[PDB]
Symmetry: C2
Subunit: 263 residues, 2 copies
């Protein structure tokens, strides 16, 4: 059964989290928008394949908004990893298979690099390494405008607008409030903090992906870096949100990829 | 000064070709549509930097229509390379910097692999290694349908529909006649014959590119291969036709890339 609730960690964050299943641990880290309801559908699919799946809203986002200012400002992959570690310690998850897109992907990599003992295998998807043109001045306009622009951008990069709309009104209302916060703390600090250096990439197994429909230039360095480092790299259908656009295919990938590292 | 001409080579092909400038040779091999008029603007731009630029319509296409059927059936990069070598001998171009997209890129690689003495440096763009979904059965369709389908596909993937439209009605009238020809002879045999083996890639300098706006999956294999093989890889603005969509950026890429291997 899916359990849903809150837990407050020693850093002051009141986390909203969800769990389902039993078996080896799989952790699903949201993308920058910090909304874990995006994992609902695939979560059931992955859990039913023999894994305990854990997901959560990110600090200051959505239902995890009751968190100290510090937890949502000047965000890096390493900063978020530190908070995730704390959360995992509280939930007693010693080792796991970790997924993450965008800033979630940065966190995955930071975990692979600085907390190898806790990662069975990392699945990063579209690691931000450069700040995209369309988001250069996102923080320069009114909050309401940010919400509107980001709402349109996210939909456009959803990979399936119908499924994006189908996330529901409750999710979209939460996203509306996350957009400005995200813009102030993420886009400028996340990309330069990408742990994509050679010394970050070889302690644990990594399976890297990029969206099949995502314009080549956006995550082009992701591919090149992976290939050069001899790390498995491929695409997933969709764009920025494979777990929303193609939940079945997304679940299958996580299951198969994690299943191969089990022993 | 732009010279335009026709010349019949010993294989029976009546080629149509154009040339401009003086200096080291630059050859612009068209894409699968074999329409060299798409290189019009950039041709002058390249030429003005001290290069003799040569382009031509491809066998069976457009103004090089008068050609033996064999020359546009069961087409591979290697078959095209052969025909092009003969033409180069006939125009007395000994060594050249060669650009090519799609099947033109397959041709470039074949030239780099089999006729290395004739290539100063190769510039392949979007080498087909797989056949996309859409063209999976466009060879069992019919001439009017194909021209309707392909004309839209190309516009879509043009990278700039205004510029594509601005090519003119003569151009599109010729393209109209080529679509089916292209379809019966290219799609099924070009991708499987891609000269992207280890042995094909290290005899001469190669600078590989992919479209910046092209969906990642399409030429994902190109990136992985280049990176794995230590070959320079990057993006160019646009999609499939950077010479049409972004003439100045294209011309700059070609000139700068070529200048690297001069003197």
């Amino acid at each position: 059964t899916r359990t849903r609730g809150y837990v407050t960690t020693k850093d002051g964050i009141k986390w909203y989290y969800e769990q389902e299943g039993s078996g080896p641990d799989v952790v699903l880290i949201p993308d920058g928008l910090g909304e874990c309801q995006m994992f609902d559908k695939p979560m059931s699919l992955i859990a039913s394949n023999g894994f305990r799946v854990t997901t959560f809203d990110m600090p200051g986002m959505s239902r995890s908004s009751d968190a100290p200012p510090e937890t949502y400002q000047d965000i890096t992959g390493r900063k978020l990893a530190g908070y995730i570690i704390t959360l995992l310690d509280t939930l007693d998850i010693k080792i796991a298979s970790v997924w993450g897109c965008a800033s979630g992907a940065s966190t995955v990599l930071a975990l692979c690099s600085d907390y190898p003992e806790r990662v069975r295998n990392g699945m990063p998807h579209e690691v931000p390494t450069e700040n995209p043109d369309i988001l250069l001045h996102i923080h320069e306009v009114d909050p309401a405008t940010i919400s509107q622009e980001m709402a349109a951008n996210s939909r456009a990069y959803s990979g399936n607008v119908e499924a994006w709309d189908a996330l529901g009104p409750e999710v979209h209302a939460r996203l509306h409030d996350n957009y400005p916060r995200w813009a102030y703390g993420y886009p400028r600090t996340i990309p330069p903090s990408a742990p994509v250096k050679t010394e970050d990439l070889h302690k644990v197994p990594i399976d890297w992906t990029v969206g099949a429909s995502t314009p080549t230039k956006l995550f082009f360095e992701n591919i090149v870096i992976a290939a050069r480092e001899g790390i498995n790299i491929g695409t997933l259908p969709g764009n920025h949100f494979p777990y929303v656009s193609h939940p079945e295919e997304f679940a299958k990938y996580v299951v198969e990829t994690s299943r191969k590292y089990l022993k």
